[PDB]
Ligand binder design. Structure first.
Ligand code: A3P
Length: 195
């Protein structure tokens, strides 16, 4: 299928831990914003995609077998259609807790030089969900978060979708993917030192 797992949850829903877990389970290498922080030239792919280019997703994800997090979650419909055999994982969270975490981290802007273009490109990524509305407004952002959960559940067949909280750890994830439960601890990446 080329793609094993497409994570379509928003950032700050445990996506770094899910990345690590998919990697442990042999479903990786797993794309994540971390890959763009390691190689900022990858920003060009997402800048093109946000701008309406006919993206070659096999080139965007060359070298990777799964993806989680933004930016790819802002293209979730495209990717579910492009990779119909991939399993889809929607990570969820209390949406109020989610937004409060975002305001301290990835949405801080809404109140090295290799990342000069990062904020403008990711503004385009986020606004594929938020539109021109107020990202910083908790009531609005909760509505966007809840709409996305409904949209995913209405679009992806239930047998191909896992609605997942990372606090569940291995058992539900591994049952969904059809693999055994690892001995190693389930990841708990707080995803804080990038800030
Ligand atoms: N195994 C786990 N159990 C519970 N929460 C977890 C977890 N792994 C990660 N998280 C939480 O998921 C959030 C990070 O999500 P992401 O990797 O998408 O940025 C962090 O919470 P906070 O957002 O409250 O700090 C982190 O503590």
């Amino acid at each position: 299928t080329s793609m094993e797992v497409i994570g379509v949850g928003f950032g700050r829903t445990g996506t770094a831990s899910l990345r690590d877990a998919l990697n442990i389970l042999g479903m990786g290498p797993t794309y994540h914003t971390k890959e763009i922080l390691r190689d900022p030239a990858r920003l060009a792919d997402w800048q093109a995609a946000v701008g309406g280019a006919d993206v070659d997703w096999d080139q965007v994800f060359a070298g990777y077998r799964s993806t989680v997090d933004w930016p790819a979650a802002a293209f979730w419909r495209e990717l579910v259609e492009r990779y119909p055999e991939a399993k889809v994982i929607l990570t969820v969270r209390d949406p109020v807790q989610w937004h409060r975490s975002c305001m301290r981290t990835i949405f801080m802007a809404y109140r090295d030089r290799r990342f000069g273009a990062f904020n403008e490109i990711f503004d385009g990524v986020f606004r594929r969900h938020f539109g021109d509305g107020p990202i910083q407004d908790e009531k609005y952002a909760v509505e966007v978060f809840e709409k996305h959960v409904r949209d995913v559940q209405e679009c992806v067949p239930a047998e191909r979708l896992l609605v997942y909280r990372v606090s569940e750890g291995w058992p539900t994830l591994c049952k969904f993917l059809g693999v055994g439960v690892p001995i190693v601890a389930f990841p708990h990446d707080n995803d804080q030192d990038a800030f």
